[PDB]
Amino acid sequence: HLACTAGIFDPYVPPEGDARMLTQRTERLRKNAASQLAIRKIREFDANFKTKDFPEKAKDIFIEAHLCLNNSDHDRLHTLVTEHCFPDMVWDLKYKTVRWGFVESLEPAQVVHVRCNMYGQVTVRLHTRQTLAIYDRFGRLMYGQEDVPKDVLEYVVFERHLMNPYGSWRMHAKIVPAWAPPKQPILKTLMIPGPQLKPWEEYE
Amino acid sequence: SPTELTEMRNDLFNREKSRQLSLTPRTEKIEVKHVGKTDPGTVFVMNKNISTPYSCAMHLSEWYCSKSILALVDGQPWDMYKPLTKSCEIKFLTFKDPDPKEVNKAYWRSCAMMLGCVIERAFKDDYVVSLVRAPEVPVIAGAFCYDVTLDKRLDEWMPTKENLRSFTKDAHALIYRDLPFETLDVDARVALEIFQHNKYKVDFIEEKASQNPERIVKLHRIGDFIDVSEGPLIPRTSVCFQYEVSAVHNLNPSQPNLIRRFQGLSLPTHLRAQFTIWDKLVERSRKMVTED
Amino acid sequence: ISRKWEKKNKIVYPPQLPGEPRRPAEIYHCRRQIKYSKDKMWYLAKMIRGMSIDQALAQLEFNDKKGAQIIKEVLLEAQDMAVRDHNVEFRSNLHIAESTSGRGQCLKRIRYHGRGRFGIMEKVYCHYFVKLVEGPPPPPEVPKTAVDHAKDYIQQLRSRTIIHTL
Amino acid sequence: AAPKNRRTIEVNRCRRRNPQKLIKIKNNIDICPECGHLKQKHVLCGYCYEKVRQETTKIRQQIGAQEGGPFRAPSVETMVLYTGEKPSEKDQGKRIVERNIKRPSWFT
Amino acid sequence: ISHGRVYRRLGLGPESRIHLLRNLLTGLVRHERIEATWARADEMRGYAEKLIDYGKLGDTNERAMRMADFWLTEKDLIPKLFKVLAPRFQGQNGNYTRMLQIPNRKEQDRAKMAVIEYKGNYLPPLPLPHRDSNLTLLNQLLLGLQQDL
Numbered sequence A: 001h002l003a004c005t006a007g008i009f010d011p012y013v014p015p016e017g018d019a020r021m022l023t024q025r026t027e028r029l030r031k032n033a034a035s036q037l038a039i040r041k042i043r044e045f046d047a048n049f050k051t052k053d054f055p056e057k058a059k060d061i062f063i064e065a066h067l068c069l070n071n072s073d074h075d076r077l078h079t080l081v082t083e084h085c086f087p088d089m090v091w092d093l094k095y096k097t098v099r100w101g102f103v104e105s106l107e108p109a110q111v112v113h114v115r116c117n118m119y120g121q122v123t124v125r126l127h128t129r130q131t132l133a134i135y136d137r138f139g140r141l142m143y144g145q146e147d148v149p150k151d152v153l154e155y156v157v158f159e160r161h162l163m164n165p166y167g168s169w170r171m172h173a174k175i176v177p178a179w180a181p182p183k184q185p186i187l188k189t190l191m192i193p194g195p196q197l198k199p200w201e202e203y204e
Numbered sequence B: 001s002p003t004e005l006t007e008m009r010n011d012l013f014n015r016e017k018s019r020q021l022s023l024t025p026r027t028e029k030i031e032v033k034h035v036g037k038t039d040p041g042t043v044f045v046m047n048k049n050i051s052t053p054y055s056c057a058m059h060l061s062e063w064y065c066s067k068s069i070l071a072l073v074d075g076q077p078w079d080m081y082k083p084l085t086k087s088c089e090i091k092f093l094t095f096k097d098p099d100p101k102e103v104n105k106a107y108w109r110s111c112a113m114m115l116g117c118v119i120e121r122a123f124k125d126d127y128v129v130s131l132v133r134a135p136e137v138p139v140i141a142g143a144f145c146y147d148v149t150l151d152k153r154l155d156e157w158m159p160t161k162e163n164l165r166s167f168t169k170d171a172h173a174l175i176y177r178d179l180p181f182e183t184l185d186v187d188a189r190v191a192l193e194i195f196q197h198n199k200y201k202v203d204f205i206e207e208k209a210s211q212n213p214e215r216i217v218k219l220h221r222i223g224d225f226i227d228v229s230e231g232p233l234i235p236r237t238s239v240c241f242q243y244e245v246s247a248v249h250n251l252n253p254s255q256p257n258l259i260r261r262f263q264g265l266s267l268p269t270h271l272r273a274q275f276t277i278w279d280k281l282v283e284r285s286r287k288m289v290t291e292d
Numbered sequence C: 001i002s003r004k005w006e007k008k009n010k011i012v013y014p015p016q017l018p019g020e021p022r023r024p025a026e027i028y029h030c031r032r033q034i035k036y037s038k039d040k041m042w043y044l045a046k047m048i049r050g051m052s053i054d055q056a057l058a059q060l061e062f063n064d065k066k067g068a069q070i071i072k073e074v075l076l077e078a079q080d081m082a083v084r085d086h087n088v089e090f091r092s093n094l095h096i097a098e099s100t101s102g103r104g105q106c107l108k109r110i111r112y113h114g115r116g117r118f119g120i121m122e123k124v125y126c127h128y129f130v131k132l133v134e135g136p137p138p139p140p141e142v143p144k145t146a147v148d149h150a151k152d153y154i155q156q157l158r159s160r161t162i163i164h165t166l
Numbered sequence D: 001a002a003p004k005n006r007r008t009i010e011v012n013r014c015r016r017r018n019p020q021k022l023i024k025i026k027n028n029i030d031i032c033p034e035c036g037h038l039k040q041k042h043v044l045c046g047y048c049y050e051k052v053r054q055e056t057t058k059i060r061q062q063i064g065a066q067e068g069g070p071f072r073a074p075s076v077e078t079m080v081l082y083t084g085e086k087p088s089e090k091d092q093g094k095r096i097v098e099r100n101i102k103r104p105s106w107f108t
Numbered sequence E: 001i002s003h004g005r006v007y008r009r010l011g012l013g014p015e016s017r018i019h020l021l022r023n024l025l026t027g028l029v030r031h032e033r034i035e036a037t038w039a040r041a042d043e044m045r046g047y048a049e050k051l052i053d054y055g056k057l058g059d060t061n062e063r064a065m066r067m068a069d070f071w072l073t074e075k076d077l078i079p080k081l082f083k084v085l086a087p088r089f090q091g092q093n094g095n096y097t098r099m100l101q102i103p104n105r106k107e108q109d110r111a112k113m114a115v116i117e118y119k120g121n122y123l124p125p126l127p128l129p130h131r132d133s134n135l136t137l138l139n140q141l142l143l144g145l146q147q148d149l
């Protein structure tokens, strides 16, 4: 049984300078031709789905999901996110302790584009400052700063199974814009191994 | 008192270190590819201005750390402990290289600097001793030479055989203490202040500043002792295994001050010598060495 | 059968506080089933105790015993996971904190003889335990000098208390 | 004659842990400059010797095919030539072995 | 009790030692490079050197022909000794054979291994040890002493 589908039905293309930017909201109205028919499909099963008010509900799930990581609330996190999202979030955090906090959001969240036997997928735009610090099994710090805020802009996709009566909005994936800055480097150092050769072979 | 000079000299060395550290914010990753003959092509991502060649040797194996005395960064000789600066190609130099002439000079310079440290602390604080310079002589000469100027009160004093043995004991204690060689590149203006009292050191600092376009000069510190260096020095004092103060020769035209050139020989742990061979080398190292 | 050595690798320490030194890494590795005598293997374990990772590996490469080859293989596996999973930066910065061998489940058979006699045949198996601590081997102990011995003897005499007296 | 009593582990432990019975460390370990691998001071390198021994078999395999029969050892001197190398006048009157590979750097 | 002994005890008897040495000598001549146990290789090194002298003596020598036939089971080698090995070593006065230590066999017996080869052969050069260069610091110090002397 699958309650989510990997990938995005229609990939929204973020425009450079959107962070600087009413305005963008009108662009959705201009682009409602592509998305409003999709919005109707979510509305048909729900009828309370509005692009203006959806981000608040989605934002709570996104923030809550990250909070579960601090407490390792795997059971809670499963409900918050779809099955596709969960493996990425927690697999690499095994035997690690992370302190995550949410600073005030820089800009209000707004729905960006939606494209759904029926899995409604809604793209949301979020810019928020957060704090991250990950430590080793021994407690040694390996990544992030305990009390320094980092401003991150990302687009988050939630997915709900419209057909199922029990279907609910769960985070499915995050769309990363190319203009987004690179992630912070790790504290530890890595080594790129040299070419491996047999005794007969010689270095080149 | 000489102790007062060391205290202030040490502070300026410490403050300069802090300024350079503060100058670099955060850890910047630099891709350094290994161009050394052995294990070529390995690329390490290291922290800029923090990571040193010794860290890379630790990454590979303990053999590299023990056998690596110097590093060739982009074809340039770098100290094993000098923090890296940028992405580059690194190769490790050992005492058994086919052409150790570059390696020999660094050992030659370090031994001369170590000898200078012994002279200043060998005498009692009552006496006044000023170091003039470390003459550069070829290894073929058979001894490394350090020039020092004594006070008029010592014009009639010459070291005896027991006194020479005492100097080796002080030098041997330094080797046993195993003090790593600190390295700082400092501008002439700050260096002149650090060595303002010793007029002879002032001119030597000026010469190095004159050669390079900037005023940056190479300063090396062994614990409290600090001195200028013509080039790269040994990472630690423990490298030397045999050490001897062969003889001291007083320069004839030494009216304003008594300029003495001290002769010594040293051998690294990697290259030990037979007792008979060492005795002959010491005998051959007791002859005045001129600069040609 | 007990496999607590593996569980020692699953221990997770609490997050280190700001006022705490960087915790040295500890790695426990073992091979539970080895067709080798524990007593014979112990000889190898005893010598390598306290030595560096590189020095122990170098000695094993030139060792004639079969167990030594097994020990080197065990050492290499432990080192690989240490960098892969325990965030070890420098491979050379490892030393042998502990090395010991234990008994393993054996097999029992009857040893026939040509003259109607029989014997007890056993297929011996053993376990091998090693703990690796990141960093160079600790400096060796310095034997006490004569002066140190005399000072303690005088100190011991002073420390003496009168027995069975008011 | 059988033991009069069981030998205590403590007595047994001392016997096996006596320095004479313990395994001794070796200080003759050396490095191979050619391969960068370990070797003993009185023992040759093996990583490079692996190339030499295998190359000998390859050269010998070429020799065996050329001879084509047992008891065919030539009465004249033999030489080995690799691709890109042409026989010289001095090579006249000598068995010539042709190797498809180029002249190895180590081999001269 | 091996004081004053000048002969190794190999094979199942003195005749076997000669036959085993004969087999080793025949194999070495055919291939010019053979790997064997150090003890056996050392014993056979002297025999190989003397054989080259017999080849140098000349083909017409009746004793050499008898010696060559006995030691070399394969008769195709007899022309080779007089026409290949002997001409090659004419300039040399000795030291025709080079014997070096090889890492011990990892065959559960840890036998001491050595390689014996004929010098001047066409086989690839063995990895011989190279002495330290005079450019080393210690040698340079000795060079200064030499110049002074």
Ligand SMILES: [Zn+2]
Pocket (backbone or CB within 6 Å): D032, D033, D034, D035, D036, D037, D045, D046, D047, D048, D049
């Ligand atoms: Zn090699």
